[PDB]
Write a protein that binds this ligand. Structure first.
Ligand SMILES: [Ca+2]
Ligand SMILES: [Ca+2]
Ligand SMILES: [Ca+2]
Length: 107
């Protein structure tokens, strides 16, 4: 992830949602620089988060979202993982597909 995002933008993004329930998908994506990157770049990042390679984000992949940016970051709270899911899901399957992630990140 550090090959596409600046280390320092990532540190700032984590610093901003350091307390529980301060995580806000749009804020994170702006601070970190994600929302400014190309589809293909956003896709690479997706591939890094999708730990089991199912092609979708769901379950524990959401609880460990930040841990993909920095391995010692905190765990998202249940409310925060719910928020991510609400933010992204567009087809009622309770998981985040590559398409859904692209749209989310880009707004
Ligand atoms: Ca997965
Ligand atoms: Ca650290
Ligand atoms: Ca979905």
């Amino acid at each position: 992830i550090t090959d596409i995002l600046s280390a320092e933008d990532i540190a700032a993004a984590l610093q901003e949602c350091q307390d529980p329930d301060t995580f806000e998908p749009q804020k994170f994506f702006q601070t970190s620089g994600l929302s400014k990157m190309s589809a293909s770049q956003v896709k690479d990042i997706f591939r890094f988060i999708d730990n089991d390679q199912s092609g979708y984000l769901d379950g524990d992949e959401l609880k460990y979202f930040l841990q993909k940016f920095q391995s010692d970051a905190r765990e998202l709270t249940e409310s925060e993982t719910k928020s991510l899911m609400d933010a992204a899901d567009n087809d009622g399957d309770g998981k985040i597909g590559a398409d859904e992630f692209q749209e989310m990140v880009h707004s």
